[PDB]
Design a protein around this nucleic acid. Structure first.
Lengths: 53, 131, 359
RNA sequence: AAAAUCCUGGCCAUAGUAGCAGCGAUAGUCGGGUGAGAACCCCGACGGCCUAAUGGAUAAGGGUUCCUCAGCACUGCUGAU
RNA sequence: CGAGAACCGACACAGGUGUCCAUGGCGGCGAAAGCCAAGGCCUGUCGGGAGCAACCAACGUUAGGGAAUUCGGCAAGUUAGUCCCGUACCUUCGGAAGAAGGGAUGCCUGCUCCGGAACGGAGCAGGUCGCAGUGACUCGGAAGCUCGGACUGUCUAGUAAC
RNA sequence: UGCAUGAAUGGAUUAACCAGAGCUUCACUGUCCCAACGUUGGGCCCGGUGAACUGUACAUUCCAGUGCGGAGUCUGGAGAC
RNA sequence: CAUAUCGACCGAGUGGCUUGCUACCUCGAUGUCGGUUCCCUCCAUCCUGCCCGUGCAGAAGCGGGCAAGGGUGAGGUUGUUCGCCUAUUAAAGGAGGUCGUGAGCUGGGUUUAGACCGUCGUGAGACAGGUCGGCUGCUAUCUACUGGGUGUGUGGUGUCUGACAAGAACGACCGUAUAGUACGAGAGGAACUACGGUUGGUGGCCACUGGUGUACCGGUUGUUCGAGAGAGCACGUGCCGGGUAGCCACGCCACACGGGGUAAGAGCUGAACGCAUCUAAGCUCGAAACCCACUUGGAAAAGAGACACCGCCGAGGUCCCGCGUACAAGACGCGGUCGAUAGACUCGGGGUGUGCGCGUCGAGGUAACGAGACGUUAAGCCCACGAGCACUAACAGACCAA
């Protein structure tokens, strides 16, 4: 259970999964990388992202 | 029976949502949902899993006008879980259904929640996608 | 009508003490006693958990999320002083105590280390004056001849390590329900000199009431007191004002009907909280886990709320009420009412959610 | 005269209560001077307000309100040198 | 003095009361907004304290729904400047019309055209940042049906503006 | 088929105009569902300043009854430091 | 086939929701209709519980009994009450409280002064006709209630007791298994019980989704500070984009059973009256209702409580200081160097979205100049959270007390 935008781990009992229009969009660690995604932003580009660097 | 999943009520009455297909559906608007209670400043409530009565605001066919029912497929408001924490995702949702509970429209646009299937099969059935 | 709000808790004052004082205690047979029938430390905020479903008749016997919820930090706590009570008519009244020569090195505030000279303010429980026996004898004699009433112990939760707490310990007496009496009296005496933890009276799956003062603001209007209807628009601009309260012979209204006053604060128990987990902060694992002295199992990264990190003895009380909030002090109990049967010594706790609160 | 929503005066409760906030102008603060006494009288610094006007010159109207010195019982929505 | 204390209004009254300064700077169409000089002021003259509760006056932001509210969309909101494109029924041919609707808009570098010239105006090419370029401020929401009175104008000083 | 329209007591109709009356649509939005949080001035406490309305008397009332038939004050109860 | 059900004539009542009467009360004035909001009640019960009857096969009903615990809405026209209509619903009952409710709101209607139309009148003007416009005063003395204090009556710290008080803390529905079974020619089509879920109500909480977020970061128009940089104003954010914490709901969690006693009813044993009889004594069961259970309050319950310990020359407490898990004043809670209570700093964790400057490129332009692009730069700026850390400030000291 890993975040698929920011990266790392996802806590055992938190972290959402939302669904977009047609099925798409995955989890979140939380509201952090979330709104970051909402604004069009790519995690492989900004600051500490596991995906980053 | 049991949703087995906690749900917060995303949309109240007079709310406008999108049918994820009926025939000539469009955007139904919510009228009281199943047997439900009330209180001062009640704001009826509704949420995924709860059968709702509704009218077809948009349309095309002479579906528009009204009567109903339909079940809310998806909602924007959180959920619950059994495993993780859960989601809200899409826009809200709703599919018209017969008293049988079957859809009155062959295809359902959009996804559907897992424990909506449990409440009513056939609705989940012609899902197209679950989860 | 229905009437707005519900009578029950009354009048709805403020709350004396920001420590809960349980009105009733479990009644027991086949018991120790605990002394600390109630035992508690207090709140950190909480996330959620994935739990295996327990043993229902039901099909669900798999992973499902429940709000693993408000993990409160407890314990250990020490009971210094078992107090007897004996003889009516009137009511319960204290007898004599016991003692303890251990004195947590912080129990000065709200206790010992009072100025030797008398102070205008009343002195709290402090003692250098000791008679362990004498108290014991007094109780025993006032057992056979006179009476005694249920005995309890003083308790005081230490802030060994909690975010922002001090030597101050605000503890209240918790009763011990053993068997006859004299058997139990012995028990509270043994667990006198000595200290305790949650893992004593407690058990995962076991249901417990929880009590604490609600957090909340001072006086507010009718609407968000017991709920009342706002409006109609006229005096809409003004604050919600209920129609006149009572009109007739008494000019004043006792009412029992919608009045502005303090809110927030409280003192109310919750019933049948399940206690999904028991815990710690020390590392223990069935298999290899992180090393380098990792931390508590459930504390979110980023800390939790204002008062962060947990690294010691915990408790998880699902569907967190908690009947109060952040860094206050809830009191545990035993489940007096009970409904469903107890679950198990432990729950599966497949996953715990750890994430910064924000984000 | 006990009386007329009676006339005139005096006086109690109301109350140490309401008002001294509301306005597109939210305005002061730190040192110092004088003084029996200084939050608001004066000096400096810092911070602000007004720009068809809270600036400049005037009509009517007021009538000495102008200037100086000495004052504080009166007046000044608190105090006042 | 000539006025949020020297005038009229019983008052050191948020009211009322004529003339000239309309050429101070940036801004911009501007005697507009906003900001700032010169000049004036801290006298629209009671202060001190509590994260300062309820309740009230003004007001900001509120997810999803979007007039379900209500006698009535009252209140609030929406639109907004400028240029280009484009613009229906009807009509007294004037109008309707800014109908509607669609696009553009900043900064920087180098230029062309109009003019005697402006610290005037209109364009061109290239480079370039932001979620957003009339970035604040200033700044219309639009369309249709019906009734009445043709129109601008007048009126119950102080509940009626039709 | 007008209870009881009608021609300068003007009839009909009408482009433009309108803080005029009624209705519909798109757009919008805390009007509403259903309320929350925050901002400023009050409110609360403190120093100073300081009124007015109103007042037959008595008065801690409540449930009933009675009475000129709509009583805190009569009657019976209840409650009340 | 009176009495499953419907039920006239006539006769006897009960209620005090409609209407009328009283012309009894008020004309030195008891503010209108309708609506709204907020509380209580009535039955004579609409649903739910337990029952009886049936013209009760079943299913679905119809009628009756006990029973008031809980429940019993949203909209379109109209000022409307009423009522008509639509879709939901278990059902969308009716009535009283000065036709409850204007020192609470609204002001659409009635019923002021303006005006039009119709009708009537010679006319002023009228109408139990229609229409457009047309105002809502007061600083609470007493009493009443909601909450908070100070005292009096019957040393202090901590923990409890429970007289009593409040609750609907739960109500209801759908689906599956039962079962395509029983019952039925067939069509059709149950139940006990066990489960899943929804709705309405109630309490609490914010990990998740969502809102706000005039903290913050960015973009950008106008203008002023000469440009650049960096900034002010545009109501108290110019506008647009994003959004942390917190607070929230549209989000999430939790809210039984069971036992005891009864009603209607079903029965047992059983006489009066040798039989019969559920009743007269006795007894077994039996409602969503009653009591308990459960949640909340509660030593001012005047029989004013109990227990343990500390203490009477010092136990404790108030003030003080630093802060909040608290808060309108007051109160409450925590810490005070035997210290991590608050701030600073650093780090962690977060928000924006890459800074100034310089270098290269850039449509072009002799050139000057040049919107903009890339690199430096996960930059820069910022944070109401956490940790580390005694650096700074919790000093100093006062007072009360048997």
């Amino acid at each position: 259970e890993i975040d698929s935008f920011s990266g790392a781990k996802i806590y055992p009992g938190r972290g959402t999964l939302f669904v977009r229009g047609d099925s798409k969009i995955f989890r979140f660690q939380n509201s952090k990388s979330a709104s970051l995604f909402k604004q069009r932003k790519n995690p492989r580009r900004i600051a500490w992202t596991v995906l980053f660097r | 029976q049991g949703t087995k999943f906690r749900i917060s009520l995303g949309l109240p009455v007079g709310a406008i949502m999108n049918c994820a297909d009926n025939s000539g559906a469009r955007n139904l608007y919510i009228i009281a949902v199943k047997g439900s209670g009330s209180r001062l400043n009640r704001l009826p409530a509704a949420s995924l899993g709860d059968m709702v009565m509704a009218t077809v605001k948009k349309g095309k066919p002479e579906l528009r006008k009204k009567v109903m029912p339909a079940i809310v497929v998806r909602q924007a408001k959180s959920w619950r879980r059994r495993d993780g924490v859960f989601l809200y995702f899409e826009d809200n949702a709703g599919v018209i259904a017969n008293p049988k509970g079957e859809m009155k429209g062959s295809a359902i646009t959009g996804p559907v929640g897992k424990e909506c299937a449990d409440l009513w099969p056939r609705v989940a059935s012609n899902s197209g996608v679950v989860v | 009508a229905p009437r707005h709000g519900h009578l029950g808790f009354l009048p709805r004052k403020r709350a004396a003490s920001i420590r809960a004082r349980v009105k009733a205690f479990p009644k027991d047979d086949r018991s120790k006693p605990v002394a600390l029938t109630s035992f508690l430390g207090y709140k950190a905020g909480m996330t959620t958990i994935v739990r295996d479903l327990d043993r229902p008749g039901s099909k669900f016997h798999k992973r499902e999320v429940v709000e693993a919820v408000t993990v409160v930090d407890t314990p250990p706590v020490v009971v210094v002083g078992v107090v007897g009570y004996v003889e009516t008519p009137r009511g319960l009244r204290s007898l004599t105590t016991v003692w303890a020569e251990h004195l947590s090195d912080e129990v000065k505030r709200r206790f010992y280390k009072n100025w030797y000279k008398s102070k205008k303010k009343a002195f709290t429980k402090y003692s250098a004056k000791y008679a362990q026996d004498g108290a014991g004898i007094e109780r025993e004699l006032a057992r056979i001849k006179k009476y005694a009433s249920v005995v309890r112990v003083l308790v005081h939760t230490q802030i060994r390590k909690t975010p922002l707490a001090q030597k101050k310990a605000h503890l209240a007496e918790i009763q011990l329900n053993g068997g006859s009496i004299s058997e139990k009296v012995d028990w509270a005496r043994e667990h006198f000199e000595k200290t305790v933890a949650v893992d004593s009276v407690f058990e995962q799956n076991e249901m417990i009431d929880a009590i604490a003062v609600t957090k909340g603001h001072g006086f507010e209007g009718v609407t968000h007191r017991w709920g009342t209807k706002k409006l109609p628009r006229k005096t809409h601009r003004g604050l919600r004002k209920v129609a006149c309260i009572g009109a007739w012979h008494p000019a004043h209204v006792m009412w029992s009907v919608a009045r502005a006053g303090q809110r927030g604060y409280h003192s109310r128990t919750s019933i049948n909280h399940k206690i999904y987990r028991v815990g710690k902060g020390d590392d223990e694992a069935n298999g290899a886990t992180s090393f380098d002295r990792t931390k508590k199992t459930i504390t979110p990264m980023g800390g939790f709320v204002h008062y962060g990190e947990i690294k010691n003895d915990f408790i998880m009380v699902k569907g967190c009420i908690p009947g109060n909030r952040k860094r206050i002090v809830t009191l545990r109990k035993s489940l007096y009412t009970n409904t469903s049967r107890k679950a198990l010594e432990e729950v599966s706790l497949k996953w715990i959610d750890t994430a910064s609160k924000f984000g």
